[PDB]
Write a protein that binds this ligand. Structure first.
Ligand code: QS3
Ligand code: CL
Lengths: 302, 296
């Protein structure tokens, strides 16, 4: 019993964190096999932040301009290439601690763990969700660039995020491990703003099923709804549209608790209308949207 | 910017998790140097233990079986002497924590780490964890520089879904015993110094709506706090909050008047750091660590 915001154990990722220094900029790199992946903005100077020409800045760099530190050991850079917004530094040593890994690009609503690092040193681990507006509500200070988001399947680490920047609202933007940004963001200091954020509906429903599995039924009601009527109500509270894919995804939790997805949608409509009335659901006074249907099954069942 | 419930990186502890099997029971063990620490319920514990031989305890570290060469009991923890010192043993200490202190929990099943979360030792000595069958032996810890301070070992779940465990010396936190019997968590209270620390974290992150011009005496605050099932705030807590008070320019008794207004009037549709409830599982140290960037 119990329901916590749970991160994956970070050990497999900690053994990959390195410090990358180019000129005055220092940030984090991900050392997998003989390559160090880091945000390409590590090559940027003071007058380069607004309109950097990364191809032009990179061609002027030599391997010895990139200082890579793994613990108290300096790795020797023997090559460099750019792939979208990530810089790939070929090093002369394969990381002996390289786990079984994959680069996966995630969709909004998907969750992952963040290993926050400064100067190639892991300082903390927490759980995140890719917001529908493609930002993440992280916990990052200056020097956290290059910190990574990941999930762990069996013994395999799926790297899904690399931290690049903070938007003016305090939310965070970054790329997948192939350097493709999530959202309409660019690695420039030009005026950028996160779009209006919405609640991840399928995740709230998954969390309502987690509450039912943990013995909380107070929010359930005798009603059901059509998917269309639920979406008409949901959009009014800035909730993401619930698709037939989401209904299908919620099938196992529905079978386990005996509460049909559209029946759970009717509880959610009522919670949106009434609020909680001094009550909590799984120790929360707000509807939690950073647990996927997959997280609920993993945590509540195994 | 940002404020998240953040756990310590778990790598140093993951390299210590082993599976312990005795008869039909399988749970987790903590392998440090040549000893595997695990809950004694894996086996009258003196009478049950004397009937066991070393080969009755099957200890598995990855796909490698460690051979048990000795066994002794210390309070509610079983110490299995093994033939091999764990090469991954980090610099460590066994520390007993006080209620209100936080720690990271590496939840394990069959000696395999599955998740990490940040917890607080509730004033009623329980933890509001997330544990399923097989999680026994999962450990709580903090990291100070490169030293892992082991502070908790999971033993059981109470009927309310909350958890009970011991320090690494086998001494239970709270009035609990390791047996299937009628046990209940006492009435819980809010960790006041931690709520204030979290209110300072909100100020550091740009949330000031709850601030007011008012101040209070420590006595008046404790009279109000006692009414709302909040732990008494001591002069030690006020002193501990000193750095955050200096950084934000809000005296501790000034934040206490904010907390008093929040307790009597509520949030009024508003949130603080994305929460509609007053969060009490971040200590003043956690707030400073997260709002400064301390690494391990
Ligand atoms: C070099 N940068 C950088 O390290 N962060 C930051 C990341 N994450 C959290 C932070 C918190 C406090 C200050 C800066 C933080 C940025 O946002 C920034 C500086 C600001 O403009 C940009 C623009 C583009 C790009 Cl890709 C990076 C940046
Ligand atoms: Cl995804």
């Amino acid at each position: 019993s119990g329901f916590r915001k749970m991160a994956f154990p970070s050990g497999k990722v900690e053994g990959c964190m390195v410090q990358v220094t180019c000129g005055t900029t220092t940030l984090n790199g991900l050392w997998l096999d003989d390559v160090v992946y880091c945000p390409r903005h590590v090559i940027c100077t003071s007058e380069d932040m607004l309109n950097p020409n990364y191809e032009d800045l990179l061609i002027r760099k030599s391997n010895h301009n990139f200082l890579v530190q793994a613990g108290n050991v300096q790795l020797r850079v023997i090559g460099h290439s750019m792939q979208n917004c990530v810089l790939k530094l070929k090093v002369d040593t394969a990381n002996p601690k390289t786990p079984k890994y994959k680069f996966v690009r995630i969709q909004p609503g998907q969750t992952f763990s963040v290993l926050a690092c400064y100067n190639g040193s892991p300082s903390g681990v927490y759980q995140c969700a890719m917001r529908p507006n493609f930002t993440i509500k992280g916990s990052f200070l200056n020097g956290s660039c290059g910190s990574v988001g990941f999930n762990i399947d069996y013994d395999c680490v799926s790297f899904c995020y690399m931290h690049h920047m903070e938007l003016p609202t305090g939310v965070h933007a970054g790329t997948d491990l192939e350097g493709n940004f999530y959202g309409p963001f660019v690695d420039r200091q030009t005026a950028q703003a996160a779009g209006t954020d919405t609640t991840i509906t399928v995740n709230v429903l998954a969390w309502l099923y987690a509450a039912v599995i943990n013995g909380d039924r107070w929010f359930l009601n005798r009603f059901t709804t059509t998917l269309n009527d639920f979406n008409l109500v949901a959009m009014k509270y800035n909730y993401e549209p619930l698709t037939q894919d989401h209904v299908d995804i919620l099938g196992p939790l529905s079978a386990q608790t005996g509460i049909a997805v559209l029946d759970m949608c009717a509880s959610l409509k009522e919670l949106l209308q009434n609020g909680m009335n001094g009550r909590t659901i799984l120790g929360s006074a707000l509807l939690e949207d950073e647990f996927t249907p997959f997280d609920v099954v993993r945590q509540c069942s195994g």
